[PDB]
Every structure is written in structure tokens, then in C-alpha cells.
Paper text:
The sodium-driven chloride/bicarbonate exchanger (NDCBE) is a member of the sodium-bicarbonate cotransporters (NBCs) within the solute carrier 4 (SLC4) gene family. In the brain, NDCBE is primarily associated with the presynaptic vesicles of glutamatergic and GABAergic neurons. In the plasma membrane, most SLC4 transporters are believed to form functional dimers. Furthermore, NDCBE activity depends on a Na+ gradient.
Here, we present the crystal structure of the truncated (ΔVR1, residues 1–39) N-terminal cytoplasmic domain from human NDCBE-D (ntcNDCBE) at 2.8 Å resolution. Each monomeric ntcNDCBE forms an α-β sandwich fold by nine α-helices and ten β-strands. The main dimer interface is generated through a domain-swapped antiparallel β-sheet, including β-strands 5 and 10. The domain-swapped β-sheet is stabilized by backbone hydrogen-bonding interactions between residues Thr341 and Leu343 from β10 in each monomer, as well as backbone hydrogen bonds by Leu108 (β5) with Val342 (β10) and Leu110 (β5) with Val340 (loop between α9 and β10) on the adjacent sides. However, to establish whether ntcNDCBE forms a dimer in solution at lower concentrations, the construct was subjected to size-exclusion chromatography (SEC), and eluted at volumes corresponding to the hydrodynamic volume of a dimer. By superimposing the central β-sheet (β1-3, β6-9) of the individual monomers of cdb3 (chain P) and ntcNDCBE (chain A), a pivotal movement of ~23° is observed between each monomer, while the central dimerization domain-swapped β-sheet (β5, β10) remains intact. We identify and describe a novel Zn2+-binding site and the completely conserved HHH motif also found in the electroneutral sodium-bicarbonate transporters (NBCn1 and NCBE) surrounded by a shell of negatively charged residues on the surface of ntcNDCBE. In the WT protein, Trp80 is engaged in a π-π stacking with His167, which is likely rearranged upon Zn2+ binding. The experiments were severely hampered by the crystal conditions, as we were only able to form crystals at pH 4.4.
Residue numbers in the entry:
A (entry chain B): 43 to 72, 78 to 171, 241 to 344
B (entry chain A): 42 to 173, 232 to 344
The structure:
């Protein structure tokens, strides 16, 4: 699994070049999207009712939530080098998966697309940076969670989506039923935090298929130290 | 769940199976052909960890242990595939080793020559840090009813597979010359394998010792009735650790 790993990091690729990442975590509960955290090697969280950004700190993760993230990449939608130039397009491509629309009602799809297209309220530094939008939260009508990892082919400035006008390269979407909100917050944190890992973040840029990503996670998990 | 099994354990009626606080010592060996070799204490725990450093000259300042995730999975793997002998009634280190080596499974993997070397290794003296009654100011720091846990890892030239054993004694026993401090031994962990696995084993040893400082896991260790209770223990622990990227 470091076998699978090394083959990826050293593939010939043009435009698939890695950039530095700004990562924003927004959350929803069905109501609008609310920015709750952001990354840039260090993490800051929204607090005191939205009044304030915390001081920057070095993120730590619950192993539990990393496993959940891993499970998400095994069972979820993974769309790489998606050529979409807007959020409508992205959401429809996800929802129109011949498998992912076979888990949802007609009624369930309506609510979810409506959610992905809700406005993003924000709290309101590298040159060639791209953005990664981690969008997680609850939707009342769901009975299953909905997971998607997307990598756009040209990065695209998705209007009003990121707190800073930066082109999006990655999106992670985790939507699920009520009572899963805190779990999703940490899964979201884990996706964001793991993208700050230098080696894993390269894998995400160069991955050609779902298993490549799992090799990335597994290699990460194999190298970290834990605090009892 | 894996806290299903867990919650069931934490609350079973058991007498003398009562949990105690733990002193844990990590000793390491290396058996290279022709070269004589004994056990050397390399670390100890009492909630905090201290390591032997600078070539055996010195103890470290006490610190809060951290573990490699890798070595914890290996440890889990050790408990899945290794010898698990709970409530062993043995009153000496000879007796304990024979019981381990006489598992109808664990002796169907070994040469006659391989059993000989390994028994010889287990019976080597244990060098402790105290230049060597003659003990410490450390002994004062030890809770009154505490029992000890001995983590023994290392290399044996003649092995080609690793050898793992987790043992819990039924009465705890003051195994002569084994612990650096006269405390009855309750737990033993043994990991012996071929040369070149030495540093890997050191971290599995640290993981074993450290996981015994865990309040919940150490309760499971005292009350486990079977190998599966231990793994639920390990899995619960893993589910709750925090990771430092």
C-alpha cells in the first residue's frame, strides 16, 4: 500500500500539477450553509456564535472519524477530472449517477439539489493556490448518507462559494439524516486536515481512480503517531 | 458493537479478578550466534513513560507517551494470532515459558532446536537500570496495591516467524529478579522474532506497555475471559485515540 503509493507520486502529468490548498468547511442543517472552519497548514474555527475566528492551531483528528472518512471514500461517489464549470453542473453530475439516483427518491433528490445550491454565508497568503470545499451537514428527508469526492479538471471559480475568490479544485460532500451533524463535522475536519498533509495532498492531485485515494489514506494512517 | 463486548466486560462479577494499578517494565534481548546476551531494561511506565537513554547511562525525564499507529495495528495482529493464556497458575519464569512453549499450536511451529534457543532466552537474567537492598526514590511513587506488567521483546537469530504471547497470571507472583522493583507480576507480553525486526518490536512493546496505562483497557485486561475480550479492548482504544498529523 506504499507499493501503490510510490507509483502515483511519480507519474508523468501536465496540468495535474499539485498546488497549495486553501480549505473551507461549510455546514448545513435543514436554512443555509454556514462557514465553520478553514485551513492553510493551520486550522481556525468559528466560535462565540459566529463573532470570531479562533487563533490558528495544529489540527488533531479523532481516529474514529478518519476511519469514517475512509469508509466514505470506499462507498461514496468519486468523480475525478470532472469537467464542470458551475455548481449546478457539479450537483447534477453527482445526483445523476445511475447508482446514486437509485438510492434516492424523486422527492429526496429535489430537497438535496436545493441544498447544494443554497447560498454560502461566510465569516465576512499563496499566489497560485486552489480551493477545496468540504461541505457537510443534515437534510431531514434523507435516510441514507450521500458522499461525493470530486476533482474538477480546470479548477473553476465557483461564484460565491469560497470566502476568498479562489478557484475550486476539490469538493467533498457529505450529506445525511438528522442526528449525524457532529459526526459529519469531524469527518469534514478529517478530510480537510488530511489535505494539508504534503504527501496525501499530492496523491489527490494525481490519483486516477478511487483505489489510488484509499492507498493515500492508508499510507497516511500508516505513518501517523497517536496520543493515547 | 465493539463497545457492546466492552460494556459487558467492565461490569462482570469477579473476585480477585479486581483491577490493580500497574507498574510496567519493557525489557529487550538480542540473540546473535556466538555472542552471549541478556535482557536489558529499556523503558518503564507509571502513567508517565521514562526511557533509558544515552547508551544506558541515564533515565529520561518522564513524559506522556505517544505511539505509532502502525505498531498498534501490529500489536492488534499479535493478539489475533498469538498465544493468549489467561489466569495461568504458574509460580516461576521456567514454568511460565514451558506453558507457553507447550501450547499444542505454538510447539507445532517450532524446531526442536528453535524451542531450545527460545527457552534459553526467556531464562536469561534481567539487567535493570539501577547500575544493576538497592532500588530507588522511584519506589515511593508507586501506588500501594500496584501489580506489575512485564513487556519482553527482542530478536532470536534462529527464528523465522515471530512468537507472541500475552499472559495473565492468576495469583500475581513476585518473579525473582524479573522486575526492577519488587512488585508482583500480573501480566506478561512476549514478542520474539528473527533478526532485523528489533526496532519494530520495540515500538510494539511500547504500544503494549502504553495501552496498559489506559484506564479502560487495563480493566479489560484484568477481566478478559477470552482472546476476543482483549481485541474488543484494543478496538475500543483505537476508536478513541487522537492522531497527530
Amino acid at each position: 500500500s506504499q507499493r501503490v503509493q510510490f507509483i502515483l507520486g511519480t507519474e508523468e502529468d501536465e496540468e495535474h500539477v499539485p498546488h497549495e490548498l486553501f480549505t473551507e468547511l461549510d455546514e448545513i442543517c435543514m436554512a443555509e450553509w454556514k462557514e465553520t472552519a478553514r485551513w492553510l497548514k493551520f486550522e481556525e474555527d468559528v466560535e462565540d456564535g459566529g463573532e470570531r475566528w479562533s487563533k490558528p492551531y495544529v489540527a488533531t483528528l479523532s481516529l474514529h472519524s478518519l476511519f469514517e472518512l475512509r469508509s466514505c471514500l470506499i462507498n461514496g461517489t468519486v468523480l475525478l477530472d470532472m469537467h464542470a464549470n458551475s455548481i449546478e453542473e457539479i450537483s447534477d453530475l453527482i445526483l445523476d449517477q445511475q447508482e446514486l439516483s437509485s438510492d434516492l427518491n424523486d422527492s429526496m433528490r429535489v430537497k438535496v439539489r436545493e441544498a447544494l445550491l443554497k447560498k454560502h454565508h461566510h465569516q465576512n497568503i499563496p499566489t497560485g493556490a486552489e480551493a477545496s470545499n468540504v461541505l457537510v451537514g443534515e437534510v431531514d428527508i434523507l435516510d441514507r448518507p450521500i458522499v461525493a469526492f470530486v476533482r474538477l479538471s480546470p479548477a473553476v471559480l465557483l461564484s460565491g462559494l469560497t470566502e476568498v475568490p479562489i478557484p475550486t479544485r476539490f469538493l467533498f460532500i457529505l450529506l445525511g439524516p438528522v442526528g449525524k451533524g457532529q459526526q459529519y463535522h469531524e469527518i469534514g475536519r478529517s478530510m480537510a486536515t488530511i489535505m494539508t498533509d504534503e504527501i496525501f495532498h499530492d496523491v489527490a492531485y494525481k490519483a486516477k481512480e478511487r483505489d489510488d485515494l484509499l492507498a493515500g489514506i492508508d499510507e497516511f494512517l500508516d505513518q501517523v503517531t497517536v496520543l493515547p
